[PDB]
Structures are given as C-alpha cells and as structure tokens.
Design an enzyme around this catalytic site. Structure first.
Site, PDB file in Angstrom:
ATOM      1  N   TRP A  47       0.462  -7.047  11.429  1.00 21.06           N
ATOM      2  CA  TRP A  47       1.618  -7.933  11.428  1.00 21.06           C
ATOM      3  C   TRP A  47       2.526  -7.482  10.293  1.00 21.06           C
ATOM      4  O   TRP A  47       2.138  -7.515   9.129  1.00 21.06           O
ATOM      5  CB  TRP A  47       1.218  -9.411  11.270  1.00 21.06           C
ATOM      6  CG  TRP A  47       2.426 -10.307  11.234  1.00 21.06           C
ATOM      7  CD1 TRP A  47       3.608 -10.082  11.812  1.00 21.06           C
ATOM      8  CD2 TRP A  47       2.566 -11.547  10.538  1.00 21.06           C
ATOM      9  NE1 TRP A  47       4.511 -11.080  11.531  1.00 21.06           N
ATOM     10  CE2 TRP A  47       3.885 -11.995  10.744  1.00 21.06           C
ATOM     11  CE3 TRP A  47       1.711 -12.313   9.735  1.00 21.06           C
ATOM     12  CZ2 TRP A  47       4.368 -13.182  10.201  1.00 21.06           C
ATOM     13  CZ3 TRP A  47       2.197 -13.487   9.190  1.00 21.06           C
ATOM     14  CH2 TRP A  47       3.504 -13.894   9.415  1.00 21.06           C
ATOM     15  N   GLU A  86       9.320   0.394  -0.762  1.00 18.17           N
ATOM     16  CA  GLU A  86       8.583   1.358   0.065  1.00 18.17           C
ATOM     17  C   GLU A  86       8.956   1.354   1.548  1.00 18.17           C
ATOM     18  O   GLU A  86       8.126   1.728   2.402  1.00 18.17           O
ATOM     19  CB  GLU A  86       7.078   1.160  -0.125  1.00 18.17           C
ATOM     20  CG  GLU A  86       6.676   1.337  -1.579  1.00 18.17           C
ATOM     21  CD  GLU A  86       5.248   1.819  -1.807  1.00 18.17           C
ATOM     22  OE1 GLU A  86       4.519   2.213  -0.858  1.00 18.17           O
ATOM     23  OE2 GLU A  86       4.853   1.838  -2.989  1.00 18.17           O
ATOM     24  N   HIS A 143       4.047   5.018   0.260  1.00 16.62           N
ATOM     25  CA  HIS A 143       5.045   5.533   1.202  1.00 16.62           C
ATOM     26  C   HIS A 143       6.101   6.283   0.453  1.00 16.62           C
ATOM     27  O   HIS A 143       6.524   5.838  -0.616  1.00 16.62           O
ATOM     28  CB  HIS A 143       5.666   4.397   2.042  1.00 16.62           C
ATOM     29  CG  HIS A 143       4.626   3.479   2.601  1.00 16.62           C
ATOM     30  ND1 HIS A 143       4.004   2.516   1.825  1.00 16.62           N
ATOM     31  CD2 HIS A 143       4.001   3.445   3.807  1.00 16.62           C
ATOM     32  CE1 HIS A 143       3.035   1.955   2.518  1.00 16.62           C
ATOM     33  NE2 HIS A 143       3.011   2.493   3.725  1.00 16.62           N
ATOM     34  N   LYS A 170      -4.221   4.793   2.188  1.00 14.32           N
ATOM     35  CA  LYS A 170      -3.254   5.189   3.188  1.00 14.32           C
ATOM     36  C   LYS A 170      -1.994   5.754   2.554  1.00 14.32           C
ATOM     37  O   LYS A 170      -1.468   5.177   1.619  1.00 14.32           O
ATOM     38  CB  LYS A 170      -2.916   3.990   4.059  1.00 14.32           C
ATOM     39  CG  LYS A 170      -2.013   4.337   5.224  1.00 14.32           C
ATOM     40  CD  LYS A 170      -0.591   3.870   5.016  1.00 14.32           C
ATOM     41  CE  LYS A 170      -0.430   2.391   5.335  1.00 14.32           C
ATOM     42  NZ  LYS A 170       0.971   2.248   5.716  1.00 14.32           N
TER      43      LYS A 170
HETATM   44  C1  LIG Z   1       1.137   1.887   7.087  1.00 13.75           C
HETATM   45  C2  LIG Z   1       2.577   1.974   7.536  1.00 13.75           C
HETATM   46  C3  LIG Z   1       2.718   3.249   8.391  1.00 13.75           C
HETATM   47  C4  LIG Z   1       4.077   3.305   9.102  1.00 13.75           C
HETATM   48  O1  LIG Z   1       5.087   3.458   8.078  1.00 13.75           O
HETATM   49  C5  LIG Z   1       4.089   4.536   9.987  1.00 13.75           C
HETATM   50  O2  LIG Z   1       3.471   4.497  11.092  1.00 13.75           O
HETATM   51  O3  LIG Z   1       4.704   5.556   9.569  1.00 13.75           O
HETATM   52  C6  LIG Z   1       4.329   2.029   9.915  1.00 13.75           C
HETATM   53  C7  LIG Z   1       4.215   0.753   9.078  1.00 13.75           C
HETATM   54  O4  LIG Z   1       4.361  -0.414   9.910  1.00 13.75           O
HETATM   55  C8  LIG Z   1       2.865   0.715   8.363  1.00 13.75           C
HETATM   56  O5  LIG Z   1       2.786  -0.428   7.502  1.00 13.75           O
END
Ligand SMILES: *C[C@H]1C[C@@](O)(C(=O)O)C[C@@H](O)[C@@H]1O
Ligand SMILES: *C[C@H]1C[C@@](O)(C(=O)O)C[C@@H](O)[C@@H]1O
Lengths: 252, 252
Positions: A47, A86, A143, A170
């Site tokens: 979500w 981010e 990110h 991640k």
């Molecule tokens: C984890 C993050 C990854 C994305 O940025 C992506 O698929 O590149 C999408 C986002 O909704 C996710 O939070």
C-alpha cells in the site's frame, strides 16, 4: 540466509516474489482498488500510503489499511510511506512518518513495513525494534531517482541495512545508461555471493532497467514490482507479463 | 549500425531474431525435422551440418541443403558446420571444411554461412571473399564451451571479426559462475555501443547464461537461439517461450 516467511510465502527462495502497489487517493478509491486487485495474481500487496490524500488523520490511514486487509486477508500486506525526499508523492514531517509507521505496526493490520534507511540511525533502530516487538517485518529501503551509485556504494548501503536489523534490504536506482543497469546487477550478485545473510530486493528503474525486474532469480533479487493498471515507478510492466517471464526463467 | 537483410528479415534492428537449428543424420531425418518445424515460429533456420552423417561427400551435403532450401523456400537459411574444436559433433579437416563451405556458397542454396574465426587467416579471408562474391552473408563465429574469456578478449575477437569482413560477428561462451554471465553482457554492450558498425550475436550458454539469450534487445545481441524440441546448445529454451519474453521486453 535467514529467509522471511509471511503468510506461508517464503521470501528469499525460489522465484522472485511479485509485489504490486495499491494507490488510492481516498477511502472510497482504496476500497475500489482493493476489490479490483483481488483478481490479479501477485505475492505481496504494497500500500503506497503517500498516494493517500488523508494522511493527516491516523484514523483515516488505519481505516484504509483495514479495508485492504479485509479484501485480502491471506495476502502479505506491506505498508509503505515513500517520503518525498526518496521519490514519493508528498512531504510530511519525520515525526508524522514515524507515527504512521508505528500505528501501522501496532494495529496488527499489516505484515511488513517499509522503513527508509536514511531517515536517521536512531529513529531507524527504534522503529525496527518496535516492528519486531509486534511481529512485523521491515523492508529497509533506499532510492536514487536521479542516478546509479557505484556498485560498491550500493553494497555498502545494503550492508548498513543489514547492520540496522532490516529483515529485507531494498535498493532502487535510476539508470542513466545501459551500463548503469549492469552496475545494479553486479551489486545484486555481490550481495548474493558475499553478504548473503538475508533476502535483498534490488531494481534499476525506467525502461532501460526493465531487465533487472525480470532477472532476480539469476542475480539474487528476492522480489520484483509489477503494475496492475498504473505503475508505481518507471519501468514496471504489466503484472501478468512480469509473471510469465519469471516463470519462463525459473523453469529454463 | 548497418543491418543485414535476408528474405525480408532485418537483422540488427527491433526485436532480436530467433534462430533454430535443424539436426538430422540423413535425408529422411532432415525431411522429418523440416516438416516438424513447420509448426514452430522462428526467423532463421540454421542447418547444423556437423550432426549429418555423410559429410564426406560434397554431393550428399549439397543434396541435403537443397532438401532444406526447398522445404523452407522463404526462410533465411544459415549453413553451419560446427567443428569439434568449437563444440560440434564431429571433426573435419580444414580443407574439407573449406570445400563444403565453398560448395554451399556457390550453389545458391543458402543465404548465410557460419565461418569460424579460428579456422586460419588465409582460409577465413578467402572464404569471406567467396561468400561476398556470391551474395552470401558471413556469420563469423567463435565458441568456448569450457569457460568465459575476459570482456577485453571477447571485445577484441568481435572487432577482429569485423575487421575481417564478417557481416555478423558471433561469440558463444560457457559461464563457470554468475559473474561470467555479466562479463559476457558487459562485452556485448561495449562492442555494440563503441565499436560495432553491424549486428553482433552473443550468448552465455547453459542455464546460468539464459538471461543473455533473453536480453539481446537491451545489451546488443541481434539474434538468439531457441529450441523447437531438442536444443543445439545448453541453455536454449523452448522457442515459443523465447518469443514470449522477447515480445514483452520489446514492448515494455
Ligand atoms: C520499493 C519501491 C520500488 C519502486 O520504486 C519500484 O518498483 O521501482 C516502486 C515503489 O512503489 C516501491 O515502494
Ligand atoms: C552459433 C551457435 C550458438 C549455439 O552454440 C548456442 O545457441 O549457444 C548453438 C549453435 O547451433 C550455433 O551454431
């Protein structure tokens, strides 16, 4: 490797797990999206809370989470407020971010939360501990929507997340070239081969990075994002096509 | 990039082209394979001559080539004797290899020929000239079925093939690690972005390398091999699955 098992889904083994993002602006749209998403096939529902336009009310946020949980009682549910810093949709205070995450954690409505590594070390440690005290897993995240750091810098960040107690580190980065996509794959593999103590999720975003969303089984990304109807980030493809490719690679 | 166009197929633009190998011992087996292959969808037919029994007779080889040409009159036809030295099914003298290739070329029966770079400089140059004088394209090739050379060594080989007049340089290498797969992708991308003025074909073989057979559009491989029922090298996947993946990547 310490895998993460959520509602019988083993993250860090087998085929990369498919995550889709739910984005609704209000309670009625969240309800409608949750219902519509039931017929798509995916492993984990994220979500994207920063797309919700009544984040001002903790009650409204929790009621939305409950609506999703009730539509999908057996799906791993991941609560993600992506900060504007981010690449998210709106700016809120650090205290508001932490409050929403703690409320999500202690509500019992979600299985996992996304916590950004660079929120601040003390706040990250406190929130990880709180998640773990309430049987919630932490996807610790980072990110770069502008560029791709060196493989070495990406690996350093992932290892820092491990050191801070992340269940699943991640990182998502933006390629400026096809070379940058290989850099991301290289970092992923380095984690897989040398710093392999829990599952990691990686992706190179945008069109050039799409292959990184498909090749997780080979180089060591435990999950991958697809799109139901609207992408939550550049480079996500239709979730059924994502699944088709993952299955072909797994069975090759 | 200057493309190679054969029978309306443009090699070196758009989606990577699908090659399948026909392997039969004799005329009846070649006919049965050609017939079975009518049900499959692919872009180029490679005849793997080294799987044929009576390679000693130039007449027998040409009669088989004619059978295949006439069975599939509108398909680009690639004549390939893979030497045992480079992972093929039987040995051949360099002089008899030259004889078969020259005969294939001047017969009008084939659109393309595979010529191994390491055959010897005089024979390579003469055979390239002969091919070109008769409107036949040369896939100049190199294979390592044991290991993966350095990216630098692979790029130099591909550039050498270009310098010797290859229409399509080609290299296939065997990974001993996941790292070796990235080395092959790196070499491919380097060649394509900085040196190539024509299409190149590359692959990392075996299960570990399968991503290299899927990701040609991104990293710069103009064609890829699939299997109709039997693979002609480790890592080739079912041709319909190959096609599915290529289409998804092309449209992403
Ligand atoms: C984890 C993050 C990854 C994305 O940025 C992506 O698929 O590149 C999408 C986002 O909704 C996710 O939070
Ligand atoms: C060009 C060469 C490539 C393969 O070795 C492969 O797909 O790896 C198959 C052979 O039949 C081809 O001659």
């Amino acid at each position: 490797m310490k895998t993460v098992t959520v509602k019988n889904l083993i993250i860090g083994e087998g085929m990369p797990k498919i995550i889709v993002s739910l984005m609704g602006r209000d309670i009625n749209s969240v309800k409608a999206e949750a219902l519509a998403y039931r017929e798509a096939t995916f492993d984990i529902l994220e979500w994207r809370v920063d797309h919700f336009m009544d984040i001002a009310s903790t009650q409204s946020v929790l009621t939305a989470a409950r609506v999703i949980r009730d539509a999908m009682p057996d799906i791993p549910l991941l609560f993600t407020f992506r900060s504007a810093k981010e690449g998210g949709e709106q700016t809120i205070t650090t205290q508001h971010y932490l409050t929403l995450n703690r409320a999500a954690i202690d509500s019992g409505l979600v299985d996992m939360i996304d916590l950004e590594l660079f929120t601040g070390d003390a706040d990250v440690k406190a929130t990880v501990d709180y998640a773990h005290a309430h049987n919630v897993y932490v996807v610790m995240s980072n990110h770069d929507f502008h560029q791709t750091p060196s493989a070495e810098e990406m690996v350093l960040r992932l290892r820092k997340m491990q050191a801070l107690g992340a269940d699943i580190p991640k990182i998502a980065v933006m390629p400026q070239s096809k070379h940058d996509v290989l850099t991301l794959l290289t970092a992923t593999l380095e984690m897989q081969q040398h710093y392999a103590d829990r599952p990691v999720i990686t992706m190179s975003m945008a069109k050039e990075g799409v292959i990184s969303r498909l090749a997780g089984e080979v180089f060591g990304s435990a999950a991958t994002f697809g799109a139901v109807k609207q992408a939550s980030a550049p480079g996500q493809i239709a979730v059924n096509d994502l699944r088709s490719v993952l299955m072909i690679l797994h069975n090759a």
